[PDB]
Amino acid sequence: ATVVQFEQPRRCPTRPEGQNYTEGIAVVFKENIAPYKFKATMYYKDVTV
Amino acid sequence: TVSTFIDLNITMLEDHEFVPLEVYTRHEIKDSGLLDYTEVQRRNQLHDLR
Numbered sequence: 079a080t081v082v083q084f085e086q087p088r089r090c091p092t093r094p095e096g097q098n099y100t101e102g103i104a105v106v107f108k109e110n111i112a113p114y115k116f117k118a119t120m121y122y123k124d125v126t127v
Numbered sequence: 128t129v130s131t132f133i134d135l136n137i138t139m140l141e142d143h144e145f146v147p148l149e150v151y152t153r154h155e156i157k158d159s160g161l162l163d164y165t166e167v168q169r170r171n172q173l174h175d176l177r
């Protein structure tokens with residue numbers, strides 16, 4: 079009357095193929111907060127009485 | 128030779144060093160202001176001795 083069976087093998091997950099990476103050289107720039115700086119010369123005369 | 132074993136490959140996670148990184152240093156921030164009040168004062172208080 080009562081009859082059972084063994085379970086058969088299963089499909090195991092495939093190992094994912096994986097990511098591909100591009101080799102490159104990179105230079106990262108940011109916002110400039112430094113003021114523009116340039117040298118100048120002042121000419122004036124102090125006066126007093 | 129045939130094998131009854133099932134393979135498994137475990138490689139340890141390699142070491143990795145973190146170098147210090149700053150987007151802006153505090154000297155650049157102090158230089159961000161168009162006029163550092165202290166330096167202006169020190170320059171302008173030398174007129175008689177100069």
Ligand SMILES: *[C@@H]1O[C@H](CO)[C@@H](O[C@@H]2O[C@H](CO)[C@@H](O)[C@H](O)[C@H]2NC(C)=O)[C@H](O)[C@H]1NC(C)=O
Pocket residue numbers: 095096097098
């Ligand atoms: C990175 O390159 C490999 C090269 O083999 C890609 O392999 C592909 O694998 C998928 C499975 O998702 C297949 O559909 C493609 O036919 C394979 N292509 C080739 C040329 O073998 C891999 O998929 C690529 N990266 C990603 C994220 O898929």
Ligand SMILES: *[C@@H]1O[C@H](CO)[C@@H](O[C@@H]2O[C@H](CO)[C@@H](O)[C@H](O)[C@H]2NC(C)=O)[C@H](O)[C@H]1NC(C)=O
Pocket residue numbers: 136137138
């Ligand atoms: C066991 O460890 C890794 C897979 O996790 C494999 O080692 C790397 O294999 C790649 C090619 O897939 C080589 O370019 C590297 O030199 C290997 N070493 C490292 C540290 O990446 C290794 O092949 C695996 N074992 C088998 C039998 O495939």
